[PDB]
């Protein structure tokens, strides 16, 4: 929104004053971004394109400078007015930086250069450090994309073992429910979009809006009509079955998919007590796939139970792998899902003989909110400065061998393995490796740009 | 940004399909928000005003409907085109709802009505539930404001025991360093603002912009420059426990100290390594050796010329552990401040305070009926007991019957396109500050 538009105020306060802290005769700076470890050994890189389009969407102006000079003096921070005025007057307000990055969607082992930021102007060498705050927030779409990607590898494994069509099934197995459980609208759009790197099912409309505006994708994902807790109960307990039948009247057509929520005990009652008998026929006659979502009881146990109970209500087919596929009905567990309980469910149900085709998984806050900058120990570090015309390495520990100097990422041509290297070694090892980064942004201009489909192809091709 | 400027698409996909799921003859609905428990026993209510100003900043338009209709059909959801067109053509595109809420800054025990949402138009009764997704996100400013307020009560306790000016010291004792570690710019602005409900110090400039645009506050908070070491009243310098020790014993430290006192500025040391508790106590012990102290009127030591801010590993537990160690060591709580970043602005979720928005009543065939899973149900509100200030939840019909003992504690903040009751941040700060454990 409009009150946040000024780029000069999109930073931590203390970093506005960093230009005064450089040695005299400093001429240039070079930064890199990496995951220093954390929950997973590899990260799907995603979201930088959206961050750049949204946070650097116009030249800096004199009005930006006036506003930032006034606020920062009152707030108590020094502000390099003359430095910003020169950038506006001489460089047309375009940030004199070059950003290189691994193509979005690639999956890269931890401890590797994911992007570099370099100054492209001697006077305005300090601009990269000014952008650390907004750039380091790339940790969020990277981490969400990674969590979603890791779940995809678990689901893909079980579909490969138990499904006749594992890649036809896989895009719909993890559904984003996190729009209400995430901390703002912008994070819903960006984290939801990061999920869509790996799957097609989402209820986070904001992610469609971002994918459409920033990743050239008119309709990045899909969903289905689904019942709410509130709507069912408000019919009253004496007409509760009529609420479910109305779901069928409104949405159940051949080839259509409709979800209904119910607590686990009512599901058991409906299959035992024969008032659900007319619900079964209307379900069967509809030709629709009715997805049942249990919303009480143990997240793992209840899936297996629903499968067994629905099997006796609706029957099953045995597929080519020897696993049962229920007729007409499916189960989605939307509660308590994380990579461990998800794996537990899949282990439980396939051991019971049910194909992974039968179940889907909803994740909300656990996908979009329960991540932080430490999940993958994200860092954005200075690695080199040019002083008195000479580049000097910048680092803290000499060990982690530690990354220093002007850096890039290499991909080995035969194996596809990644490794970080000095820009000095992109020759030399030509023949065995190619430079895996690309220039995505330079001096106010976005250069290399991806569609979400291009992002999806990198992520889908990556395996554990 | 502009690509998110369509309220019809600020919701969960399935809510597009929802108006068809009510029983026939439904013509009103009623919802309330509460914390169902979690980490703390009470929540500081904050952020709804920002959410409404941003998420409902204009009347819905026909362009909004065209856009939503096309996207939702392709996405796979039905779309109540006629219902939205009616809201545009008949109601000027203003949402027919009434939102009531406890004044922002109030601190309310869990399991209580914090806000209510009611429909005000028979034909458009389904709008409150459409808005659940964006309204329930109020959990985030509430929870940041609560974590920040819970910390404040801890520091306050130790300042009342050890400081000669507890309430003058308190507003600077928790600083926000959270902008790198939060998921987005908008979260940074809103969560940063939620912290400023309780304190004055922040490095999250985005929070100043939100407070200025949404809470009528030009300069909501302050900071000091920080020499990272590889007017000017106060300065932060980064260090470690051993570094201070080496300065004391190496001769470059006696001229280092000469410069510090000759400058007459207060130096704030931030250690960035070591056990949070041990490193604060040791820095204090070494800084006392180097610069001396005064004994304040409670008998605790206040260092000359130096302060310590611990910005690493801070949470309500380590924070208290620190305060306990230094005060047992005889040091006043004046000497130290605390920084939180992602631990404040990011490491919270909707389950921290178990936030929920629930339908409690619908009108069907003329008659109101309760909706529920003893349970809270019906058309609800919050009461404040007039003598004790204690809150409880009640049915609207009970307000008059207890008018002698209590007042209705909600206010109407928003109705039919118009914000009514509206707060400055200083009013919010006053409610939070008056509340105690
Ligand atoms: N289409 C749907 O049924 C839908 C959409 C969004 C959220 N939800 C529900 O909202 C809850 C989300 O919980 P969390 O966001 O805290 O994970 C879950 O119960 C989820 O099932 C359901």
From Swiss-Prot, chain B:
The keyword Repeat does not apply. It catalyses: beta-nicotinamide D-ribonucleotide + diphosphate = 5-phospho-alpha-D-ribose 1-diphosphate + nicotinamide + H(+). Diphosphate binds at residues 180, 229, 270. InterPro entries: Aldolase_TIM, DUF5598, N/Namide_PRibTrfase, Nicotinamide_PRibTrfase, Nicotinate_pribotase-like_C. GO terms for molecular function: nicotinamide phosphoribosyltransferase activity. Changing residue 180 to A: Loss of activity. This is Nicotinamide phosphoribosyltransferase. It comes from Xanthomonas campestris pv. campestris (strain 8004).
């Amino acid at each position: 929104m409009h009150y946040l538009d000024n780029l000069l105020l999109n930073t931590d306060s203390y970093k506005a004053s960093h230009w005064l802290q450089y040695p005299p005769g400093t001429d240039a700076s070079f930064f890199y971004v990496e995951s220093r470890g954390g929950v997973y050994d590899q990260t799907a890189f995603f979201g930088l394109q959206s961050i750049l389009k949204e946070a650097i969407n116009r030249p800096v102006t004199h009005a930006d400078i006036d506003d930032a000079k006034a606020l920062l003096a009152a707030h108590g921070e020094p502000f390099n007015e003359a430095g910003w005025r020169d950038i506006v007057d001489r460089l047309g307000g375009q940030l004199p930086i070059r950003i290189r990055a691994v193509p979005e969607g690639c999956v890269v082992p931890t401890h590797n250069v994911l992007m570099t930021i370099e100054s492209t102007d001697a006077k305005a060498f300090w601009v990269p450090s000014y952008l650390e705050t907004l750039l380091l927030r790339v940790w969020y779409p990277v981490t969400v994309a990674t969590v979603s990607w890791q779940v995809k590898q678990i689901v893909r494994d079980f579909l490969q073992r138990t499904s006749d069509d594992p890649e036809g099934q896989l895009p719909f197995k993890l559904h984003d429910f996190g729009a209400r459980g995430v901390s703002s609208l912008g994070s819903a759009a960006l984290g939801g979009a990061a999920h869509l790197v790996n799957f097609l099912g989402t209820d986070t409309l904001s992610a469609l809006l971002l994918a459409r505006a920033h990743y050239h994708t008119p309709v990045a994902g899909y969903s289905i009509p689904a019942a709410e807790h509130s709507t069912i109960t408000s019919w009253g307990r004496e007409r509760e079955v009529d609420a479910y039948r109305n779901m069928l009247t409104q949405f159940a057509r051949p080839g259509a998919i409709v979800a209904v929520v119910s607590d686990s005990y009512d599901i058991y009652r409906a299959i035992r007590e024969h008032w659900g008998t007319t619900l079964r026929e209307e379900i069967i006659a509809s030709g629709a796939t009715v997805v049942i979502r249990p919303d009480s009881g143990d997240p793992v146990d209840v899936v297996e139970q629903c499968l067994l109970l629905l099997d006796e209500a609706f029957g099953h087919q045995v597929n080519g792998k020897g696993y049962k596929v229920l007729n007409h009905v499916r189960v989605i567990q939307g509660d308590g899902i994380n990579p461990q309980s998800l794996r537990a469910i899949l282990e439980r149900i396939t051991a019971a003989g049910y194909a992974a085709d039968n179940v889907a998984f909803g994740m909300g806050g656990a996908l979009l909110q329960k991540v932080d900058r430490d999940t993958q120990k994200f860092a954005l570090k200075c690695s080199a400065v040019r002083v008195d015309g000479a580049w000097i390495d910048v680092y803290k520990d000499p060990i982690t061998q530690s990354k220093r100097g002007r850096l890039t990422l290499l991909r080995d041509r035969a194996t596809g393995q990644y490794r970080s290297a000095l820009l000095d070694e992109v020759a030399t090892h030509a023949g065995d490796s190619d430079d895996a980064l690309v220039t995505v942004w330079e001096n106010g201009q976005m250069l290399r740009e991806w569609t979400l489909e291009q992002v999806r192809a990198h992520a889908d091709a990556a395996r554990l």
